[PDB]
Amino acid sequence: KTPLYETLNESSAVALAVKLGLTLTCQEIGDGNLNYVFHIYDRALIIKQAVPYAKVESWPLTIDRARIESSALIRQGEHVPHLVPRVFYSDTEMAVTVMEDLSHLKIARKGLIEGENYPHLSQHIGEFLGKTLFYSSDYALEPKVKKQLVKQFTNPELCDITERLVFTDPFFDHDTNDFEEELRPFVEKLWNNDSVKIEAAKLKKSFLTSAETLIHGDLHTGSIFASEHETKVIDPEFAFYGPIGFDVGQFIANLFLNALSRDGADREPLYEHVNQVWETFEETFSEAWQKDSLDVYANIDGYLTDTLSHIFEEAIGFAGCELIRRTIGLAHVADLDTIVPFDKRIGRKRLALETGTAFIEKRSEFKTITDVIELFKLLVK
Amino acid sequence: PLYETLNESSAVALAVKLGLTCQEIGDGNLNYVFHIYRALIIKQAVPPLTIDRARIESSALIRQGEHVPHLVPRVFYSDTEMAVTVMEDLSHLKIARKGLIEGENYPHLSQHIGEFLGKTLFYSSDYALEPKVKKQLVKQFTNPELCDITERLVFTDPFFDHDTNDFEEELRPFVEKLWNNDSVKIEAAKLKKSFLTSAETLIHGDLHTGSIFASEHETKVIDPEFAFYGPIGFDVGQFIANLFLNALSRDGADREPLYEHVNQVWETFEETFSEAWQKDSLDVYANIDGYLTDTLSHIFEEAIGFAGCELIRRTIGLAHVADLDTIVPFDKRIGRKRLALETGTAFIEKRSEFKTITDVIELFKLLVK
Numbered sequence A: 001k002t003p004l005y006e007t008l009n010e011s012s013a014v015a016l017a018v019k020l021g022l023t024l025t026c027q028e029i030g031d032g033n034l035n036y037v038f039h040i041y042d043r044a045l046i047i048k049q050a051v052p053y054a055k056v057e058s059w060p061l062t063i064d065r066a067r068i069e070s071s072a073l074i075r076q077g078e079h080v081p082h083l084v085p086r087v088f089y090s091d092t093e094m095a096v097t098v099m100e101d102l103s104h105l106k107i108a109r110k111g112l113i114e115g116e117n118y119p120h121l122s123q124h125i126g127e128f129l130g131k132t133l134f135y136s137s138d139y140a141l142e143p144k145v146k147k148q149l150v151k152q153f154t155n156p157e158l159c160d161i162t163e164r165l166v167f168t169d170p171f172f173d174h175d176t177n178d179f180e181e182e183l184r185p186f187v188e189k190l191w192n193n194d195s196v197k198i199e200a201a202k203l204k205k206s207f208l209t210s211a212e213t214l215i216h217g218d219l220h221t222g223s224i225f226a227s228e229h230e231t232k233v234i235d236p237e238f239a240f241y242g243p244i245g246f247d248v249g250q251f252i253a254n255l256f257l258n259a260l261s262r263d264g265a266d267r268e269p270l271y272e273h274v275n276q277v278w279e280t281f282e283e284t285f286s287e288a289w290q291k292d293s294l295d296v297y298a299n300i301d302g303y304l305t306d307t308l309s310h311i312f313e314e315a316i317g318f319a320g321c322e323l324i325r326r327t328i329g330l331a332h333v334a335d336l337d338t339i340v341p342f343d344k345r346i347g348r349k350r351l352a353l354e355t356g357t358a359f360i361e362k363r364s365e366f367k368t369i370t371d372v373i374e375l376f377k378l379l380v381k
Numbered sequence B: 001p002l003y004e005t006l007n008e009s010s011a012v013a014l015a016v017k018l019g020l021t022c023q024e025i026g027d028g029n030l031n032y033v034f035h036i037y038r039a040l041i042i043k044q045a046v047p048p049l050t051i052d053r054a055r056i057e058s059s060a061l062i063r064q065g066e067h068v069p070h071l072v073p074r075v076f077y078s079d080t081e082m083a084v085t086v087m088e089d090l091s092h093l094k095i096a097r098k099g100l101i102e103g104e105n106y107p108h109l110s111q112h113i114g115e116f117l118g119k120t121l122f123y124s125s126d127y128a129l130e131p132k133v134k135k136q137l138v139k140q141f142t143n144p145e146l147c148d149i150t151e152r153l154v155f156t157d158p159f160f161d162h163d164t165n166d167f168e169e170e171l172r173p174f175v176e177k178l179w180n181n182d183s184v185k186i187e188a189a190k191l192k193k194s195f196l197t198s199a200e201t202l203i204h205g206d207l208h209t210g211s212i213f214a215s216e217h218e219t220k221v222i223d224p225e226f227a228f229y230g231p232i233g234f235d236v237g238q239f240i241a242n243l244f245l246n247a248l249s250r251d252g253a254d255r256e257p258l259y260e261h262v263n264q265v266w267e268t269f270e271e272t273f274s275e276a277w278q279k280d281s282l283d284v285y286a287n288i289d290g291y292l293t294d295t296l297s298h299i300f301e302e303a304i305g306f307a308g309c310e311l312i313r314r315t316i317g318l319a320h321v322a323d324l325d326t327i328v329p330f331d332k333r334i335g336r337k338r339l340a341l342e343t344g345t346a347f348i349e350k351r352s353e354f355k356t357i358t359d360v361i362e363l364f365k366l367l368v369k
């Protein structure tokens, strides 16, 4: 058999949607250069397709990621179908996912920067977190089943992006970092900080080795669609078997990153979201543990409590890496880069480094999410 | 289907067909071990458990042979479909558990196994390997059925009133004390969760004294059928526990060689792992002062915790050790088995308190006086 992959265009995408049985118009609406996102109208549909390195950032990547993203979306839909787009069709060789159109929603990072507060965002994401992370763990699944899922969701290339960018590069004078010269005194203070780098190393080691559950792997505010009443998580291409606290930490850090871009009393909705997302995660995870654990140890008093404390500790450490990583690393966030005037931008970026560092160092000292919030507020006054 | 169960005649046929008298000498019912005489061993899995364990065993032995060829039997041929490994004959050696029970002291056993542990455990980790490579090895060495036996027998069944357990009734009061101990069971749960999730290196997975050939001058580790990507501390802990199990079967001053072994195996492990880390780590963090030290402390902590589960598991679970079961008279056996439970319990609960291997040894000695 011949190679089946062919790069879609707007006409090809309409032809595909028809051949698959789902007068039409199509527009390519993709935000980056690694994927095409084809919007098809009249009822609407999205066809997403991975772009191979030769035709593309980038970042040399195979189109295998499309298989991960599709399979991860489908898995999430079995547990939280109201919190992810529906998937109608997918194909590994064509590297295509056909999914629900969510054009009536706005990317959460964009809305947050515009000053939208999204009152239910943390309640929805906390539920997403609690259910996705529990139901794919050894707590919820027979170990033989979970062990096959580890193989199926092994994601070497995309893991390599996170291992480098989240956990390694910002902490050294590496080629991928990207920061203003005004920041250099403070960046160098990080590079020279042995005790924080040792802690980042341990966190990386956990990312590399702790195959606890199927994670989303890139759950930032730009990876969520939002309106006042709805929330949908997208693009689980980084999915693999990793630490439970990782997704929780990345999301929380992106909430703090937005808080930093804001001023004064405007920060309060974000601090409320940090509190609510932890609380809802913990409640959701705990309810799932109680009802659906297969573990004979699950209902011994203190075991769930200690499990949550460890997830919490790692989540805050991971949050700290993300705070740092987004500030001086290859991949930045609009929350910080669009701060004006310039000297304010530098000052707030200095604070993301300082808060990130404190999170990493003090992760095992915090007892509750409010301790984390209260420490943050003091540091950013 | 290409699989056919060998007999003594077809074993020699295979050895000749591969261009390399016969007696089946296997000490269990799941594998045939054919000795052919220059000499050769042909091990074959029999078809409850998949014959895929033979592919794991061969692959694991070969990988071990890349780093410690002097400490594992050489492999000449292997075949997944036939479930065979053709390997070096080690008939001139004795199973270390048997020798230890007979009173052999094996002066180099500790230095040899410590070297085996340091090198096998380092060189298959993320410390030594590109993460993309390690991740392929994780897939290759996934071992669901064998891992299942360990998850059940080492980490679960002894801590509850489960059907697989096997203990003398005189031991019941002390068994029920363990079952009723919430805080120890929570800690066993955490160690099981680490076994289930922490894919740190390719481990042997069943490194007890019955899995080692020994003489005065030579040591060879065998049967890595349980191999998979698991916690670095696991093999270290199981081995140490089996040294302590032999100490419990001995009396007084005759225990000293075993305590010496426990000390030397940790020391040699730590030294070997540290030397490899220093020379062969790919990690940009490797050389920050404190990171290796903290890495070792965590390995140590887990090892002690896993030693505790192995002490308990061997005493009251499905799979016993001859060290304990052959103690006479009865009443002494029961006493020594109560101590294996109490020491294993202390190891699990106190694992993060110990600062050095000496602390572990001294605590054990105190308890078993």
Ligand SMILES: Nc1ncnc2c1ncn2[C@@H]1O[C@H](COP(=O)(O)OP(=O)(O)CP(=O)(O)O)[C@@H](O)[C@H]1O
Residues within 6 Å of the ligand: A029, A030, A031, A032, A033, A034, A035, A037, A046, A085, A099, A100, A101, A102, A103, A107, A222, A223, A234, A235
């Ligand atoms: N289901 C959907 N409904 C409506 N618009 C969608 C959509 N999926 C994607 N889009 C549009 O396409 C953009 C790109 O989506 P997505 O984040 O999946 O692409 P990407 O994977 O190429 C980005 P990255 O490289 O940062 O991960 C979105 O921000 C959105 O505007």
Ligand SMILES: Nc1ncnc2c1ncn2[C@@H]1O[C@H](COP(=O)(O)OP(=O)(O)CP(=O)(O)O)[C@@H](O)[C@H]1O
Residues within 6 Å of the ligand: B025, B026, B027, B028, B029, B030, B031, B032, B033, B041, B073, B087, B088, B089, B090, B091, B095, B222, B223
């Ligand atoms: N390389 C070798 N050289 C000489 N004898 C060997 C040998 N490998 C195995 N044997 C002999 O056969 C016995 C069974 O070997 P082994 O322990 O590998 O098998 P097994 O896997 O069937 C046991 P278990 O069921 O407990 O795991 C050994 O105790 C030893 O006496």
Ligand SMILES: [Mg+2]
Residues within 6 Å of the ligand: A035, A235, A237
């Ligand atoms: Mg993407």
Ligand SMILES: [Mg+2]
Residues within 6 Å of the ligand: B223, B225
């Ligand atoms: Mg065996």
